Amino acid sequence: HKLGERVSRTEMTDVTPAQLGETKVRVLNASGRGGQAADVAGALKDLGFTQPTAANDPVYADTRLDCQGQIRFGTAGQATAAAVWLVAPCTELFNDGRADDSVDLVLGTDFTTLAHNDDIDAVLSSLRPGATQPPDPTLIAKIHASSC
């Protein structure tokens, strides 16, 4: 239905991602694959995200979401959404106008695993305690300009 405003790759590439331990992520299953939200929430926790929650998506409850998925957030949560987008780079971004800083990672039918490579890993290291350098904007731009 109404998911809010589609946010462009161009706009989100300029957002500095949140520290992973300062995020509030919910993983929502819209894929039809049992246990997938719990699996991905655990994988996010292993990367350093504050323990995400895992549940079913109420929006696409009656039809599965036929793509990689979505990241849904409000303006207060945009840096968290930018952090999630590093590891789910082929999802669609929606600002749904919520007033808090929570972010929903919605798994579609096509989602398989979180993304990882040397560039993503380099950026994620800057979002953990003891980061040696601030998140590298060139790598962030490269990840999102070259994906999907």
Side-chain angles (χ1 to χ4, degrees), residues 3-23 25-63 65-131 134-148:
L3 301 147
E5 157 194 39
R6 179 74 171 276
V7 172
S8 66
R9 168 202 85 236
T10 298
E11 176 171 2
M12 185 65 44
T13 296
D14 286 338
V15 174
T16 300
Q19 301 297 118
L20 307 183
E22 288 177 359
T23 61
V25 176
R26 305 191 188 89
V27 185
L28 302 178
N29 181 316
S31 71
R33 293 166 211 289
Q36 193 174 31
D39 293 336
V40 169
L44 290 172
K45 190 180 178 161
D46 291 343
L47 295 169
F49 287 80
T50 302
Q51 167 81 84
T53 73
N56 284 347
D57 176 28
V59 177
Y60 292 86
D62 293 308
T63 57
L65 172 61
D66 285 322
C67 58
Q68 293 290 303
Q70 300 173 338
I71 300 171
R72 306 175 186 155
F73 55 97
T75 299
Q78 69 176 16
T80 293
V84 179
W85 196 39
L86 292 169
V87 293
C90 296
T91 57
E92 301 200 340
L93 306 170
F94 287 93
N95 183 325
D96 69 359
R98 72 184 69 183
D100 72 17
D101 58 0
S102 66
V103 173
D104 302 334
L105 170 61
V106 188
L107 308 182
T109 59
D110 303 349
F111 194 90
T112 52
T113 64
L114 298 177
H116 75 93
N117 59 41
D118 285 351
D119 291 346
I120 291 165
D121 290 5
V123 177
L124 295 173
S125 75
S126 305
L127 308 179
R128 297 191 181 104
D136 187 329
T138 302
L139 295 184
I140 292 168
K142 174 188 170 187
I143 292 161
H144 297 305
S146 65
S147 287
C148 318

